[PDB]
Structure formats: structure tokens, C-alpha cells
Short mmCIF file of C-alpha atoms in Angstrom, two decimals:
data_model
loop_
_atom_site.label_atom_id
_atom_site.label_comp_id
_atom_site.label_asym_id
_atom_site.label_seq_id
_atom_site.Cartn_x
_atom_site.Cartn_y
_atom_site.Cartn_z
CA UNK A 10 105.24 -130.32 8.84
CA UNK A 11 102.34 -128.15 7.83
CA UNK A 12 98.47 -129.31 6.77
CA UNK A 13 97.23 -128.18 3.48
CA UNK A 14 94.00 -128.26 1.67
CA UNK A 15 93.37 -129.06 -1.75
CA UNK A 16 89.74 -127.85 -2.70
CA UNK A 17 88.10 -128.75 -5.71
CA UNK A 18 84.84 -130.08 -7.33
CA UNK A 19 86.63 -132.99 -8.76
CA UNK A 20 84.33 -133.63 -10.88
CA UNK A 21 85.60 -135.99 -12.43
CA UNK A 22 88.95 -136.57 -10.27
CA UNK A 23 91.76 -136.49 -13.16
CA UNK A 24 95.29 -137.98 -13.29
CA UNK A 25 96.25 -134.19 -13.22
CA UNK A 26 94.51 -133.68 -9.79
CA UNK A 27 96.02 -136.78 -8.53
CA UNK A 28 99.88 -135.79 -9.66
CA UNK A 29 99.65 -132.36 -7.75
CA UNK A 30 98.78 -133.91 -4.51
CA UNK A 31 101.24 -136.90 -4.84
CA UNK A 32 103.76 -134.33 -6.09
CA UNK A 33 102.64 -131.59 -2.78
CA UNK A 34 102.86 -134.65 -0.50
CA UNK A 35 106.73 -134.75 0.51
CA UNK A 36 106.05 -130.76 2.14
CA UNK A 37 102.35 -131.59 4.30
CA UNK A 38 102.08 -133.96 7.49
CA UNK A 39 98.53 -134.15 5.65
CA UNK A 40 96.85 -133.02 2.26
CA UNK A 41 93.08 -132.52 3.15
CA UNK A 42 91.61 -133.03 -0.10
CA UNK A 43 88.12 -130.51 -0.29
CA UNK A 44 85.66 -131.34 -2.48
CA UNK A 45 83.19 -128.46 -3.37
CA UNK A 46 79.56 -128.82 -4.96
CA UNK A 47 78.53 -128.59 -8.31
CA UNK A 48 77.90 -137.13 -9.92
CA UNK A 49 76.58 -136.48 -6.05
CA UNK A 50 78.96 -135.18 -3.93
CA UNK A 51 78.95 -137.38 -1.59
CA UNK A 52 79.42 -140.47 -4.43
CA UNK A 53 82.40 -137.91 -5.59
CA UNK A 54 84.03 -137.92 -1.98
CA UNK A 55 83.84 -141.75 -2.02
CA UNK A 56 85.31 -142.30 -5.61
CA UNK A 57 88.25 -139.78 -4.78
CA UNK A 58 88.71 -141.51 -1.21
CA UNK A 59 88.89 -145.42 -3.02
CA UNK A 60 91.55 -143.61 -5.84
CA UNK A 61 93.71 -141.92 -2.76
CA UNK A 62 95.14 -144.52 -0.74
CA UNK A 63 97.95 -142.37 0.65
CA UNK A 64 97.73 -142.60 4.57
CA UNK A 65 98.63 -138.60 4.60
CA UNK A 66 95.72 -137.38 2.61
CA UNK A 67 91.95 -137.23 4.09
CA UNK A 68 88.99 -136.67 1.54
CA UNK A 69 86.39 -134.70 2.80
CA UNK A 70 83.11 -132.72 1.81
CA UNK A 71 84.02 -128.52 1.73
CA UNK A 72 81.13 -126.83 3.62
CA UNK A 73 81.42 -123.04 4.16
CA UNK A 74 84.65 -120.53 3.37
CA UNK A 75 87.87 -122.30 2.72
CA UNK A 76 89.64 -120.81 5.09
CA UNK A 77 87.04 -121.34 7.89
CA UNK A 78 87.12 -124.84 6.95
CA UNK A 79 91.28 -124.51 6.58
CA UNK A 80 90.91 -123.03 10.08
CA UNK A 81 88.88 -126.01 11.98
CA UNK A 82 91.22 -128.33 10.10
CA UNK A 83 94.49 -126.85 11.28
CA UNK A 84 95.93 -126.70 7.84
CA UNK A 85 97.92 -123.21 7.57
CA UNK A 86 98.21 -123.39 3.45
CA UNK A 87 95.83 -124.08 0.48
CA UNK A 88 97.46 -126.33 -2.35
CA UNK A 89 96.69 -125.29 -5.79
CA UNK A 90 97.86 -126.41 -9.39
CA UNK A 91 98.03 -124.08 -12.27
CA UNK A 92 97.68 -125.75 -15.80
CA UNK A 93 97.57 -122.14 -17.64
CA UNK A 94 97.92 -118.48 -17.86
CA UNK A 95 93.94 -118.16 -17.86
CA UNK A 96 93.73 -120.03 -13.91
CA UNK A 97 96.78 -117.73 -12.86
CA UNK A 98 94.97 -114.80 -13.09
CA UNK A 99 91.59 -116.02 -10.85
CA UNK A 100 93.66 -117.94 -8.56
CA UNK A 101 95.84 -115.38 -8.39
CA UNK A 102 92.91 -113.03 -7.20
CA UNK A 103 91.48 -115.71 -4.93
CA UNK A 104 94.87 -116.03 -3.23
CA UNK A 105 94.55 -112.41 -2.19
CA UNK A 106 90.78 -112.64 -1.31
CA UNK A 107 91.51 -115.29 0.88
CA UNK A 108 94.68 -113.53 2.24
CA UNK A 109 92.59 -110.59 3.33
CA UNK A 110 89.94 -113.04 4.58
CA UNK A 111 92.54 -114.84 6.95
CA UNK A 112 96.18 -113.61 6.76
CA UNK A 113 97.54 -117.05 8.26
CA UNK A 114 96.81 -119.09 5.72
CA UNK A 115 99.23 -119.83 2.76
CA UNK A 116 98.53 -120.30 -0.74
CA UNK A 117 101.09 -122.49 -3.09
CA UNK A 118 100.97 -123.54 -6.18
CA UNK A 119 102.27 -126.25 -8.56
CA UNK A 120 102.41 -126.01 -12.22
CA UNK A 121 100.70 -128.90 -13.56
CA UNK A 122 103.37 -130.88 -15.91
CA UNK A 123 103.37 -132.41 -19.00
CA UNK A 124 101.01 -133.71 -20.72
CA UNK A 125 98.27 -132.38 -17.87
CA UNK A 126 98.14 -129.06 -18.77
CA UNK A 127 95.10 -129.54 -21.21
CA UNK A 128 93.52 -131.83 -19.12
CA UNK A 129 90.41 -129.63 -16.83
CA UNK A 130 87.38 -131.32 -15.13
CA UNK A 131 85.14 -129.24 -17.72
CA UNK A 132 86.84 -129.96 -20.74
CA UNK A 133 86.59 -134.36 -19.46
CA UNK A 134 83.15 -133.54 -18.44
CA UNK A 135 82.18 -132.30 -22.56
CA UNK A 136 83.73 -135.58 -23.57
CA UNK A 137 81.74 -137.76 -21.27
CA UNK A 138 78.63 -135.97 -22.07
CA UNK A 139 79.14 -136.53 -25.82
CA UNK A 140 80.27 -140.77 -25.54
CA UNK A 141 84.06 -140.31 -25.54
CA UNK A 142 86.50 -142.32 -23.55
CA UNK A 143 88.24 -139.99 -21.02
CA UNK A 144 90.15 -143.04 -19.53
CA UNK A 145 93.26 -141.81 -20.41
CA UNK A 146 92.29 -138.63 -18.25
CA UNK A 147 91.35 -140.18 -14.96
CA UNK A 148 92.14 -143.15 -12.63
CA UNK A 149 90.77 -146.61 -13.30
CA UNK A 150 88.37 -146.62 -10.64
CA UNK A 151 87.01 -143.15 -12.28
CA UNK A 152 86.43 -144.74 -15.69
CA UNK A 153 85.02 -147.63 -14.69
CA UNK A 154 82.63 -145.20 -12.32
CA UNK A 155 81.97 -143.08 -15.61
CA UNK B 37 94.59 -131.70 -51.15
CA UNK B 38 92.64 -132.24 -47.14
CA UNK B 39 89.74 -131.41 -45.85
CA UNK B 40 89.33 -129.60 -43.18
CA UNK B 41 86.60 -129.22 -40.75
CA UNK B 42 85.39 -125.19 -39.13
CA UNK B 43 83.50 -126.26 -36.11
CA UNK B 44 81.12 -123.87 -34.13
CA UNK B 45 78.02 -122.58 -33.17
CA UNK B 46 77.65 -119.64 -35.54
CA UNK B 47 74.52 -118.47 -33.26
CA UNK B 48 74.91 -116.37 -35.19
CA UNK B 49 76.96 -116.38 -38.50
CA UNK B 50 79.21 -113.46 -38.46
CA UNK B 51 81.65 -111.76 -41.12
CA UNK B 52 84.47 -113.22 -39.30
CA UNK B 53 83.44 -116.82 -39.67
CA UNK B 54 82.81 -116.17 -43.42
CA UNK B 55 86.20 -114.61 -43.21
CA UNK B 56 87.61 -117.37 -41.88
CA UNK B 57 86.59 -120.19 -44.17
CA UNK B 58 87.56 -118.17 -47.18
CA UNK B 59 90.91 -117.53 -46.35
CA UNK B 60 91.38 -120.94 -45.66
CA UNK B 61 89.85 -122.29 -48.33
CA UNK B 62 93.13 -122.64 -50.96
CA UNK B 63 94.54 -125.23 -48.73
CA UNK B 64 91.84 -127.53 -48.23
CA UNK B 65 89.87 -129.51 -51.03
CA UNK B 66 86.43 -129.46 -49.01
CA UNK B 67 85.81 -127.19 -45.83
CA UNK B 68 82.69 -128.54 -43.63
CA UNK B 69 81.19 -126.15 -41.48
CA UNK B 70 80.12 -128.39 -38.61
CA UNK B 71 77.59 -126.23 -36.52
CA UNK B 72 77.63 -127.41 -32.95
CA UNK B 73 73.98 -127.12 -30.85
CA UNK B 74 73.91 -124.55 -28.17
CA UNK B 75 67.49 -119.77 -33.18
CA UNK B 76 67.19 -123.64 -33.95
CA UNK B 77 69.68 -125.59 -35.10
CA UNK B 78 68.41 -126.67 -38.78
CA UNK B 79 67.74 -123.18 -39.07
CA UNK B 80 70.88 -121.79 -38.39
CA UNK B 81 72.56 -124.50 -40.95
CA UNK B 82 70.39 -123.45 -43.32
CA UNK B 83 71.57 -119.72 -43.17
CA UNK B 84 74.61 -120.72 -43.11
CA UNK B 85 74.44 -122.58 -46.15
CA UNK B 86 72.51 -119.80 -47.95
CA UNK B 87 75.53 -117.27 -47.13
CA UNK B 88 78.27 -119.81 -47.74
CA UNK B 89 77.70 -120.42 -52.00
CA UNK B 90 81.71 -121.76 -52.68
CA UNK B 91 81.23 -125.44 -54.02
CA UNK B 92 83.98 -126.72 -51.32
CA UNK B 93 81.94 -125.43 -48.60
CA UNK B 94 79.34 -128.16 -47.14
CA UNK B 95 76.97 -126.76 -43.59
CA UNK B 96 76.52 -129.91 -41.72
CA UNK B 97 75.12 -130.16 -37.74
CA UNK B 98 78.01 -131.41 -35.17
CA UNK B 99 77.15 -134.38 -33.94
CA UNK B 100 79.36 -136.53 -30.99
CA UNK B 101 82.74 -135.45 -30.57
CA UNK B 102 84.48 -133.16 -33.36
CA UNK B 103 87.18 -135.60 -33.91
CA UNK B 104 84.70 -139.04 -34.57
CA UNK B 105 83.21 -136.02 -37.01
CA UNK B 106 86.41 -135.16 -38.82
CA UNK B 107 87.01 -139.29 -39.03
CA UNK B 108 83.67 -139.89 -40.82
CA UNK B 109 84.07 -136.68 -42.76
CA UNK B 110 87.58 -137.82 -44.13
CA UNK B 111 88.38 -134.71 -42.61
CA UNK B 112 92.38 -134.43 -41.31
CA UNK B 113 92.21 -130.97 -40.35
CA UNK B 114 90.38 -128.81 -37.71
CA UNK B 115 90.02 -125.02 -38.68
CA UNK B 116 90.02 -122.32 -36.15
CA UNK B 117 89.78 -118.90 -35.89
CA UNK B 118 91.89 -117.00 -33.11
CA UNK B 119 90.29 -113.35 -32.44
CA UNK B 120 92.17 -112.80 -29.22
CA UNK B 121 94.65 -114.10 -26.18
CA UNK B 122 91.30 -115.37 -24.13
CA UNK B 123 90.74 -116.75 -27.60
CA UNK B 124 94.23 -118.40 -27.79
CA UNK B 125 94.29 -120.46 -24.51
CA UNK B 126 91.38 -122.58 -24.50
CA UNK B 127 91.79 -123.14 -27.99
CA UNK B 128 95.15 -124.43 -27.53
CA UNK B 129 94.09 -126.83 -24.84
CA UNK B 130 91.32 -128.03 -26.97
CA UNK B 131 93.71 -128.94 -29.80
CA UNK B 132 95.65 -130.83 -27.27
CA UNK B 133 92.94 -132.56 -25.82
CA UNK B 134 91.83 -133.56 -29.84
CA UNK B 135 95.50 -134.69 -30.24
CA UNK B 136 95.23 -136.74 -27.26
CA UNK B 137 92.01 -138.32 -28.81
CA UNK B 138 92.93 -138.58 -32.33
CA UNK B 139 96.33 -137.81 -33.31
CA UNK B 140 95.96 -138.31 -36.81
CA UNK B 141 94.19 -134.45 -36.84
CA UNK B 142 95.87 -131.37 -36.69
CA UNK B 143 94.51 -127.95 -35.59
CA UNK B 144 95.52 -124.80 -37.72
CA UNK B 145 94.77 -121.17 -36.29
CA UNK B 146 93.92 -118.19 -39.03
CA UNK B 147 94.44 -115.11 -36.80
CA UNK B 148 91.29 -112.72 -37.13
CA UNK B 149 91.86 -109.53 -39.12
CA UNK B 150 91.70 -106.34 -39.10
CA UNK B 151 88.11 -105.12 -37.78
CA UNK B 152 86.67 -109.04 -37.20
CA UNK B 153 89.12 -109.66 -33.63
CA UNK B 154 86.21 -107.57 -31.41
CA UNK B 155 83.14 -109.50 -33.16
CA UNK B 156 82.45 -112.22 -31.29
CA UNK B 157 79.14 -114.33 -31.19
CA UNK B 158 78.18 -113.73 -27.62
CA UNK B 159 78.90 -109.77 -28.19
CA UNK B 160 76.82 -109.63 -31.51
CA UNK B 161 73.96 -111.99 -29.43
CA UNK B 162 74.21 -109.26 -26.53
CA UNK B 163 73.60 -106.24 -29.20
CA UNK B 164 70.64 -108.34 -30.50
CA UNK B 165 68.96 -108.74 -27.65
CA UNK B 166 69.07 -104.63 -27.07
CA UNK B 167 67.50 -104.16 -30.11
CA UNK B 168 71.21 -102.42 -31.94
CA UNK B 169 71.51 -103.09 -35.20
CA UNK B 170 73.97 -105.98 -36.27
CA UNK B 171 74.18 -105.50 -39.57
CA UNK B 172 77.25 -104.29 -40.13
CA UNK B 173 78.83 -107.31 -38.47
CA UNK B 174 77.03 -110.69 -40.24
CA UNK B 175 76.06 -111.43 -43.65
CA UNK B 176 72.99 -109.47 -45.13
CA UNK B 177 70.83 -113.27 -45.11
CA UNK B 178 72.22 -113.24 -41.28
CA UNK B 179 70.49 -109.30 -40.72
CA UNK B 180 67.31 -110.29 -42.85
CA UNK B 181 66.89 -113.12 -40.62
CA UNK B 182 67.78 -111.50 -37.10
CA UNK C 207 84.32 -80.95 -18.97
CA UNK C 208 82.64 -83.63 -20.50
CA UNK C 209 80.21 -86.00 -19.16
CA UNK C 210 80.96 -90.24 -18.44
CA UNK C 211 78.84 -93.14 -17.86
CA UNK C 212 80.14 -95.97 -15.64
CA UNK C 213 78.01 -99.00 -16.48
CA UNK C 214 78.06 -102.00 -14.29
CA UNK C 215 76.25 -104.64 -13.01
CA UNK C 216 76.72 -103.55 -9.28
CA UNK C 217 75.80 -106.88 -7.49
CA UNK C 218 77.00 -105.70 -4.86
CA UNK C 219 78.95 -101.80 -4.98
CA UNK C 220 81.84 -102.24 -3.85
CA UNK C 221 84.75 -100.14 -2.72
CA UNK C 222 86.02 -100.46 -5.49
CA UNK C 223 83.50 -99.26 -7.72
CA UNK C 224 83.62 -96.12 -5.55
CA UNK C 225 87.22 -95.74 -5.67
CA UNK C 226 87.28 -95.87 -9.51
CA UNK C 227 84.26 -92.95 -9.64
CA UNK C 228 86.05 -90.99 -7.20
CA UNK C 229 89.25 -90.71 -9.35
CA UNK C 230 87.87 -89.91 -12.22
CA UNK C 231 85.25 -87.50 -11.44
CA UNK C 232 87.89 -84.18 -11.69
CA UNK C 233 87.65 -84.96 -15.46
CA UNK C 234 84.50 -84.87 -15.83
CA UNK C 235 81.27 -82.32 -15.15
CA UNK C 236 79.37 -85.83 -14.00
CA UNK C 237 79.20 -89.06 -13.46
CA UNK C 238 76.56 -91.33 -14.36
CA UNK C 239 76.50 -94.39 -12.93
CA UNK C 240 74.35 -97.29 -14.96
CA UNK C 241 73.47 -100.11 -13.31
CA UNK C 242 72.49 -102.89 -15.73
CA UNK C 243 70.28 -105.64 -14.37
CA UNK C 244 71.65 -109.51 -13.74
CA UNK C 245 69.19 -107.81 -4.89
CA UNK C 246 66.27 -106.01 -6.90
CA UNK C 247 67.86 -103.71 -10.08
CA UNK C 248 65.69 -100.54 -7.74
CA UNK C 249 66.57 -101.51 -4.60
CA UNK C 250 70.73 -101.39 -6.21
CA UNK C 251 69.67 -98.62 -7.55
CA UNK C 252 68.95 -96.70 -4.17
CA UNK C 253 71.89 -98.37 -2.44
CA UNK C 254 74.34 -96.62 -4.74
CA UNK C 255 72.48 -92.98 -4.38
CA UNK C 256 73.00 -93.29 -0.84
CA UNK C 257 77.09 -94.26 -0.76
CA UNK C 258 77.54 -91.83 -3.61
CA UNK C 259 76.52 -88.32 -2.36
CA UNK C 260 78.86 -86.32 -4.57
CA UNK C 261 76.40 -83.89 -6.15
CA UNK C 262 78.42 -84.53 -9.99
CA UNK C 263 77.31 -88.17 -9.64
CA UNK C 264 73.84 -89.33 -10.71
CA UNK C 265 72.92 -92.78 -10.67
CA UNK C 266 70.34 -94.82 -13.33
CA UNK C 267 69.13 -98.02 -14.15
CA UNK C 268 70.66 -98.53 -17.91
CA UNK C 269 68.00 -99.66 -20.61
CA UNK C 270 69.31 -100.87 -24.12
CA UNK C 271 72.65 -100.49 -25.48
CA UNK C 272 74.83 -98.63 -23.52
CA UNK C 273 76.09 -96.26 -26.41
CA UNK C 274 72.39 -95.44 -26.68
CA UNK C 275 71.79 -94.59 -23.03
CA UNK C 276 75.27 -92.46 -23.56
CA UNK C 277 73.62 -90.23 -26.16
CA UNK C 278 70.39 -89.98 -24.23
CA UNK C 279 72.37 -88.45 -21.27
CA UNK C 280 74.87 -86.57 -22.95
CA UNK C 281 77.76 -88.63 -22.68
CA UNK C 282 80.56 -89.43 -24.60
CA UNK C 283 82.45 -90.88 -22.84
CA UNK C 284 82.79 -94.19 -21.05
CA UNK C 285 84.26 -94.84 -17.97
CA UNK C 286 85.37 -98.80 -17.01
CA UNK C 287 87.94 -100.14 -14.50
CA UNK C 288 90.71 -102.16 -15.24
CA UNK C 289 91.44 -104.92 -11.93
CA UNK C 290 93.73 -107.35 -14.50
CA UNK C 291 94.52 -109.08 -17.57
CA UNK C 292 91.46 -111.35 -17.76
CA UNK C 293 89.47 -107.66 -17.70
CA UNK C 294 91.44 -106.11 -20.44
CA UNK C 295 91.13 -108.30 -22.97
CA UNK C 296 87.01 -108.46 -22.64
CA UNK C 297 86.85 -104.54 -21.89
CA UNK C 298 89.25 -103.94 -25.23
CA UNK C 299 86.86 -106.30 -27.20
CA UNK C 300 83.73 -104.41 -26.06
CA UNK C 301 85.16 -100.48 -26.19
CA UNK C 302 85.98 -101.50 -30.06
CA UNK C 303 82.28 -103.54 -30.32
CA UNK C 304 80.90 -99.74 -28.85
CA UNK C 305 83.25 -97.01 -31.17
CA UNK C 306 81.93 -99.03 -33.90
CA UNK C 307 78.31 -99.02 -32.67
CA UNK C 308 78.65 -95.25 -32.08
CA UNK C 309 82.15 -93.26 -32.95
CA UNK C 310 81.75 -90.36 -30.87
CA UNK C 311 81.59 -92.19 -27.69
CA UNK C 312 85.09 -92.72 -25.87
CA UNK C 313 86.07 -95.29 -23.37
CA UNK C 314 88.68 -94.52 -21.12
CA UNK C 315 90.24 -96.65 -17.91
CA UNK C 316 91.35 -96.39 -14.85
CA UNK C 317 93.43 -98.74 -13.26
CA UNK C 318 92.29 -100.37 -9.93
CA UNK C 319 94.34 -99.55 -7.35
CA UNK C 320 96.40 -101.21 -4.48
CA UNK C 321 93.89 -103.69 -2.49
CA UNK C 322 91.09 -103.20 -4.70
CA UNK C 323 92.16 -105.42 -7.76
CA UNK C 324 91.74 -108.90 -6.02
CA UNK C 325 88.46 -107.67 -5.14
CA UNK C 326 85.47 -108.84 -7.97
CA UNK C 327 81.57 -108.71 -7.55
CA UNK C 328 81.15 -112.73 -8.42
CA UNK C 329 83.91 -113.00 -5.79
CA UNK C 330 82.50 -110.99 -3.05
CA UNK C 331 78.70 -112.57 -4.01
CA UNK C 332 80.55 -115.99 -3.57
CA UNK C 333 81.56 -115.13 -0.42
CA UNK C 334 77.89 -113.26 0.71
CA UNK C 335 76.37 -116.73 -0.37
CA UNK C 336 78.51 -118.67 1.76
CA UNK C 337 78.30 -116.35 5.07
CA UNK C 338 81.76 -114.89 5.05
CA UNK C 339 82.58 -110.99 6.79
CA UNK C 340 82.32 -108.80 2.97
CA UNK C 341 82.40 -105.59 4.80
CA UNK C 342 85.94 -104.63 4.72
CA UNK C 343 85.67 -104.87 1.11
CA UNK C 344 82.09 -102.94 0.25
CA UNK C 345 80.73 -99.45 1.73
CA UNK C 346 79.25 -99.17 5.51
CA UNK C 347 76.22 -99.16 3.89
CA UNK C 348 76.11 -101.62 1.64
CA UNK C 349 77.21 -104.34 4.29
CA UNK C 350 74.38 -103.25 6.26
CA UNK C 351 72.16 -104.10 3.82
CA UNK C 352 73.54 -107.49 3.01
#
């Protein structure tokens, strides 16, 4: 099986970024799970690392291109989820970008289901700022961090 | 009949808010303009207040999150204004993520007319800026004052 | 024939840019290019002279509204690209925002072509910033200078 990578800033890690990976799982020998700076990014890889305890899926800090840093981790395809019509159209373009950039790597994507659709990292980030409770959003061990 | 709360930043007031909030006015008992922070705050409810004379209209500042607002307000209803598709898909995950965190609200959409669907706050706030004149897109108080 | 302006930001030219200029110049008697500021706005400035030699193409730094600098130069019309949905709906928002600032002015577009609507300024910049290859997707001269 193929190695993917699943960048992000996770920032906050929601229950919607934790269904694509679980649902991507089944078609990867590994999910390499990218996380991107902007609450420190290293604190972020930790919290993400403690929430995936999956033995196929390595959390680690993205430095550089994506698909330089697909490249040195032998991982052929990037894993993406799509909650709405307004991420289609910039991943979309970032698919071809990184297509031209390196035409061996492979971008999927997953529609995010139900009742994740709503649910983005800057929309979870308002409500934090402004004293709501976003555990419903986000893993236990998030919360509790937030 | 409810009461409904218009949420935004109004930076500034245009025609197309005004437009809003008096079309909607014949279903709701009270409409509270809740003016978010992003020139100054107290100064830009106090425009709006000047502009907005109907007895059912109250120009309050947006404090915490929208739906603790509308709770405290005895406010059941959110009001938007949809000017366009871009409009249309982060509104619509907004009044999911409110459902999510207070079901007892509902979100109604007025579609924009006519020649109001191309003003838009951060367009008018660009023209400003230039030095064009904005007066044919906000209240006459709103022109005085800009 | 009449005269265009094709505003942009420029950050960096890309080819792009050039293609859309190139295609549209047999309707018009010239092409000014107005590059509004956000690496230096002068040093842009010269960078563009030198990829665009055709003698019906002047370039300028723009100053104030755009329908402004169109009258100053004898313009009416406006020339913008179109790379994909996300554009249109800004770009239809802002030629309505400029017909009513100034009626006689026109916007027209030109579709991006091929392997040129994946390719964005912020997305190129992203990649400049990170240390990627950009020159298969700006002029000779412009990756020389970046």
C-alpha cells in the first residue's frame, strides 16, 4: 500500500480532521499527518500525536514544500478532505500547483460527512477566543488542552 | 411576535444593512442590531442608531458569542443578509455551527436586492480609503460622518 | 480602438498576467498595465517594463481609485482575468462597485487559459517564501530576480 500525507495547521485538531484520516486509513500502509505553522507547534504536534493512537499514522512538524517533504517521506499521495464548495476551488488549484511541482505525487480527497461539514479550525478558533465550549468539535484531550 | 437579532460590523453602515432590517422588520416584534468589534466601536453604534429611527430597532455592541447574545436578548432569531454565493457558504456554515450551539435559534436569509448585492463593507472601506465618494452607497449621517 | 487598463497587484508577474495582456491587446490601441501596491511597488514596476516590450503596452504605478486613474489615461475600459469561480464572483462584485462609480468605464474578461488557471500570485509567493523552483510558472526575467 501507498504513504500519504495529511497536512494541516490543526489548529485546533477537530473530530472532522480525525474522521478523514480514520476514514483514509484502510487505502495507506501509513497516513503522515503534517502539521503546518500558524498554540506552539510543537505543543500542536504533541496534542495531535496523544489523540492519534493508530500504529499507521506518524505526526510530524511540515518544514518546506509539501511535496519535498512528501518526497523524503516516500508517500506518493496527499490526503485532503473537502467540507464545501468554497475549499474545492483552492484545493482544487493547489492540487494542480503541486502536480506541476512534482507529477508523482497524488492528490485525493474525501468529502467530510455529516454533521462535519461546518466544523473548520477557524470557525472553533472564533469560539474559543470568545469563551464558548467547542468540545463537541474536538477530541477530549483537545478540550481539556483548550 | 420574535425578536430577531442583525449581527455585524457595519464598519460602515451601508444602504443594504438599512435595507435589510426594514424588510425584515414585519416579522419580528424587536430587531437588535448587534454591532460586532473589528472608526470606534461606540461610535459606530451611535451612527447606527441615529440612521436607524423605527421604535423596534435597538443598536447594541456584540459582546461573547452571538447566540449567549440572542439568549439574553430574548432573541430566537438571527437575521442575515445574503448579497452573493461567497456570501451564501460561510453563512450557511455559521448557522450550522449556531445550531450546533444553541438549537433553540434559527437563521433566516433576506436575499440582497436589486443594486445593494455589489455593496459590501470591505468594498465601500476600500473606496474610502481612495478618497471616492461613498455617498451614494450609506446613509447621508454615514457620508457626513466618513 | 479603444484604450484598457489591467490593474493588479503583480507580486510577482506571472505568465499568466502576460498571457492575459497578450490576448487582448488586438482590441485595443494600448494597454496599461497598473500595478497597485500590497518587492518594492518601483522596483515591480521596472520588472514588468522589461518582460512587456510590446510598444502598445505601457506600464504605471496606479494611485486612487482605479476608475479615476482610467479617466486620467484615457481609458474606458477595464481589462481583468478570470482563473475560476472564487474570481468571478469578487471580480462581478467589483466591475458593478466601478460602472456605478463611473458608467462609462467597461470591464471586460478574459478567461485564463490551459495551465495558467491553477497558477495565483499568493500561490506562487507561498511557494517563493518557502524555496520552491517558481520559474516555470513566471517570465525568465522575473525568476531571475527572485
Amino acid at each position: 500500500k501507498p504513504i500519504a500525507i495529511y497536512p494541516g495547521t490543526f489548529d485546533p485538531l477537530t473530530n472532522g480532521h480525525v474522521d478523514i484520516i480514520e476514514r483514509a486509513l484502510p487505502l495507506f500502509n501509513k497516513i503522515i499527518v503534517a502539521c503546518a505553522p500558524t498554540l506552539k507547534l510543537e505543543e500542536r504536534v504533541n496534542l495531535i500525536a496523544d489523540v492519534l493512537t493508530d500504529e499507521r499514522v506518524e505526526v510530524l512538524p511540515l518544514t518546506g514544500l509539501l511535496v519535498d517533504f512528501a518526497k523524503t517521506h516516500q508517500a506518493n499521495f496527499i490526503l485532503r478532505g473537502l467540507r464545501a464548495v468554497s475549499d474545492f476551488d483552492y484545493e482544487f488549484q493547489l492540487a494542480h500547483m503541486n502536480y506541476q511541482l512534482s507529477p508523482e505525487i497524488e492528490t485525493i480527497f474525501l468529502p467530510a460527512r455529516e454533521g462535519y461539514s461546518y466544523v473548520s479550525g477557524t470557525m472553533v478558533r472564533e469560539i474559543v477566543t470568545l469563551g464558548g465550549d467547542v468540545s463537541p468539535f474536538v477530541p477530549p484531550l483537545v478540550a481539556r488542552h483548550l
